Design a binder for these strands. Structure first.
Lengths: 249, 249, 250, 249, 247, 250
RNA sequence: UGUGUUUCU
RNA sequence: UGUGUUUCU
RNA sequence: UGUGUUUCU
């Protein structure tokens, strides 16, 4: 009878904006942060006197065609290329996976510098783990090259009008199942929705990231041809999207 | 033919629908008792010489921005914040998921102390998994910040005149479908009505809660702008409600 | 000695005493689940505590129909008013959580032994059951007989009813049993119908072939609850539910 | 080579159907030898100073009412009965299922000593998994109690004049389909012909058994009322037979 | 430098005699029908047996009971078990995991396949997979000669017009059924998954060199798989397309 | 500190010359092994143990031609004499199997690095190969060039020969490669010829695109082994095998 | 949701 | 490719 | 046949 009144008294209990926001800052998620990624890449690069921006491009291209394990890939590479990778590992302190807060990986570089990643994909389509022609056969259309990497999720605005964001996410999901199957063979026998379950949680975290503003994402999506000035989706996107919904439904 | 004739006689023994339904309601599943929650919080808090009212606020904010998994959220948190979460776990014996009624979770604190939860939402709406700006885009209007958590269902009086309670419930459902879609991304490809069915049962239990009286709920709904002293729904609420009904059917 | 054919043949003239044989049968017979023992123990333990034990049976059955078979567990997810009642029921009847022995009482056992009342409560509780009546109504093409919506119904099935009526009733009950088995055991939800059926048909057969109720007892029960009429004609809902079951499992 | 020539010349080597079929019959699968069973029972029984003939009777009755799983049936039995079953397992080395021919099971005892089994059935027909009253309802008449066990097949002479053996076999099948349906409830929803196929093979092997001669079988069938001294079938047998054929096709 | 070293191997000696001696040292050594027949003949004559008759009995034994003689005696009439006991004794039959000098029933059936392939015409209904079962799986009456793994030993994959490939396909139709019956864990698996369990030792059998190509041609004709003009029997080509469709 | 968001967005309008990027792709491209490194390690490890390493190369090649690329496994089915020397070769050359790093020696890589000898050994032991020369003679309409009867032959193919003669030689080699792939991997036997060709397209291309040997080196090799004459004219059997291949594949 | 997984040549 | 796997009655 | 199994909210 008084436990009810205790709870009810919290109506008049102080909800100080300042103290609440300080708690939020203490409790907030701390780990993956594109801000931290670019900061560390820039710092470590300039400390060794590198053209660090050029190193980013090379690290992204390296990531797009070889994956996320630099030490391993050197053992299966020409000496000319391996020597370059050896340096990239040295200055940027590249790890093979299981990243911590201050850890830099090739995936993280591709994700943080996605506005360039999304441009390189237009050129590398046939050298990717899943080729563009393979995706072109899976979709009924020429699949948008910009989407052919997990990092694309970072520029998706889910709140675009008329469910455009959802449709873009669907179309990207079509690539993600194929990508997930190629780098994890144990998923190749699994159903579409089972494969989707393996990526949709970190994928959602990427799409709901706040590194880029909504206007940043809109500009990126337009610049790379997913959507136009009038926010109209390209047909390849909507047709790839319905393929995805059919597979998982 | 003695013990057999006894059991056989139960055919003519009474099965009154009203008497049976009374038992069903007694024996019905109950996730937790809010009354027991505020009791245990106050008891365990004072026993350690803590400003337990302040700890309630912190646990609520922690719940709003990080969810209901205390041990897991510390693995991705600033050292400062994780330190105080560790304390809260210690003194309040915080567990995760859906344990017994004598067990405290962050989710249950926000539900039991909802008259404060509902005020904190007015402050940190942009730090939620689903932001206030997102809800503003989904509804045609500014979505009432107080509704932006499952614990809001606890202050809903379904027996308000003219089905105003059902309207408020629908307006809250507009948020709940979006919230469910991000914390459980597998639901993103499901129809709105299918998503609504995933939280129908616990949401109903919260609205049907008798911890707060109808007058208590009425006062809460007025104090937070859902309804006025004349029991008239805010325009944004009726808007969000009809958006919801059109999504669901 | 070593002519073994003649040894076996001589057992023709060997004594087959009815008295001694029946005594062996009594020693060797199955001993475990016994509705007679259940009702006896419920009645004894109830009157020893001065309870309206018949009313306790109804409450224990309703408790079983809506919450399942684990009383200690369900108290942790129940109002204090209800939990206090359950606490008493556990105390006087010595309710266990499962793995019953010969002298063990469980909620399932109460529902099974006192099935002539269980079968009446189901008419009223249909929407509060783990599998609702409306859910079964959608699975069958018809309004599924509420009386069958519990495993204990198998105890009143007479498999020897003329014209395979008993088999048809068992089929219709099997339609509910797959749904019930899937809800209380999630690991079966991905399995095929006949796989799920394999999980229950052995104890289910033991229930149908039980001898607690006579054939005339079962006939009366089945009529009283609407499965079959005075002329032993099956209700259409039963035969249509039955063919759904045969289709799933075949 | 010359070894190649040797293998090549096997092409010219014969393959007489009669000679080959003789080998098939020799090498054919044999579940157990009844002869070996009565031997081991008498040997192991006398070696422990037991009334082994009496133990045979108990094992048969035990087999008729409890089946073929000695260790399992003791878990649901009176303390008195389980005590003597434990003994029987000890002295006769009882196993379950289908082990080697040098292994005793309760099922094999009832089969080997069928001239007694067939008499016990006349006494305990209401304590069987399928009762005599049940069979009375399935047939239009009183079903011959002697047929109410799979071991009855051991005394069937298939080479009786006018296909009387086949008629007796069909009458026995009327019980066998019901017996199979209760001990293996998964078969309850199967067609009668499908159920009959589940026991066709071992039942045939029992009827084709040559442990007993035709004269031995004839004497057994007469002594138990299946047929008279003039080799005329009992009316209930021909009845049960035509009931069976109509069920099966 | 290193390039010139490699390039100099052009003028390095490739002596025919020494190379062939290395080949002989390095060559596969294990399963060899020559060794099988040699050992069967030697061990048989050392005990004064009609060893050729023993081969037939061992093959028939293999076709209807499988590859585990000690085990099958425990489920056999005393008359038959006594015979098997002798066969085990003189030929030193093992239960599996054969070494170089090991004789198994499978090995007898494989080495003496020109007789094995004749016995199958007679035993079709006593096989683990019956002829009528294979007749229902194929749309036609499946060639009895193919209803055993040992048939692969007489397949000439180099027969003109892909006839050899077609014969191998038709045999593959039986092999999936046979593999499923003796290994229950494969019964839930897809056709190509089951095929993967046998196609490696199966290929070793087809590419064996015990029989010449003309030996195989003669065998395949004698047993009706193909005719004098090397035309395939329709049952073979129809069984083959069933197999290709499954996998 | 700094904007960071702007630094990232800046990369949208950051350069992306196709030629500069493609140069990086070729540097960073996957490389199975370096033939140069292989002959180095063979000579170094061989001399360090006082061995006729040139002779060991020959034995390892012959071993590779008749037994494949799994040294530990092949010893389990080999004469005691042969297995004894294989054990040595594994020891001094540190032989591994499959596709390990570029600093690792395999039998397959020895045959590839020392292909000017491999190509001569094939002329001698063609009937001891997994696919025999007589088999290839039946598949082609003519006597199939023995020098092509191994994947390592691709290492001496000059694709930039005039009149697409390089492509013709590659196709003629492909006639063998489909058959070789079908026997070492019997699962491919039921696949279409074009599907089989796709299984070895990538490593075969890498071998032909190898720059370990110069065009003049390849030309001299191809002439010395009869694929082409001093006037760069294809042998008739090669053009035959090539058109057989194209008709199989499409 | 917490941004992971990085196969084969 | 390396010639294996041998179920249930 | 041996009368078991009792999920998630």
């Amino acid at each position: 009878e008084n436990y009810r009144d205790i709870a009810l008294a919290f109506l008049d209990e102080s909800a100080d904006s300042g103290t609440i926001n300080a708690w939020v800052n203490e409790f907030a998620y701390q780990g993956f942060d594109p801000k931290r990624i670019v900061q560390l890449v820039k710092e470590r690069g300039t400390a060794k006197g590198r053209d660090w921006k050029k190193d980013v491009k090379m690290m992204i291209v390296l990531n797009l065609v070889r994956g996320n394990k630099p030490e391993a890939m050197m053992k299966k590479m020409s000496e000319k290329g391996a020597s370059i990778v050896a340096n990239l590992i040295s200055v940027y302190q590249l790890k093979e996976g299981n990243p911590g807060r201050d850890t830099i990986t090739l995936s993280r570089v591709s994700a943080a510098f996605v506005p360039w990643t999304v441009q390189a994909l237009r050129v590398l389509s046939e050298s990717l783990p899943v080729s563009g022609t393979t995706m072109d056969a899976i979709a009924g259309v020429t699949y948008p090259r910009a989407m052919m990497h997990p990092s694309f999720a970072g520029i998706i605005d889910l709140d675009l009008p008329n469910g455009a964001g959802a449709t873009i996410a669907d179309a990207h999901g079509l690539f993600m199942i194929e990508f997930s199957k190629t780098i994890n063979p144990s998923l190749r026998t699994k159903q579409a929705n089972e494969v989707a379950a393996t990526f949709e949680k970190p994928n959602m975290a990427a799409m709901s990231g706040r590194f880029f503003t909504r206007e940043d994402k809109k500009k990126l999506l337009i610049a790379v041809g997913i959507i136009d000035e009038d926010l109209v989706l390209a047909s390849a996107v909507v047709r790839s999207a319905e393929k995805y919904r059919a597979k998982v439904g």
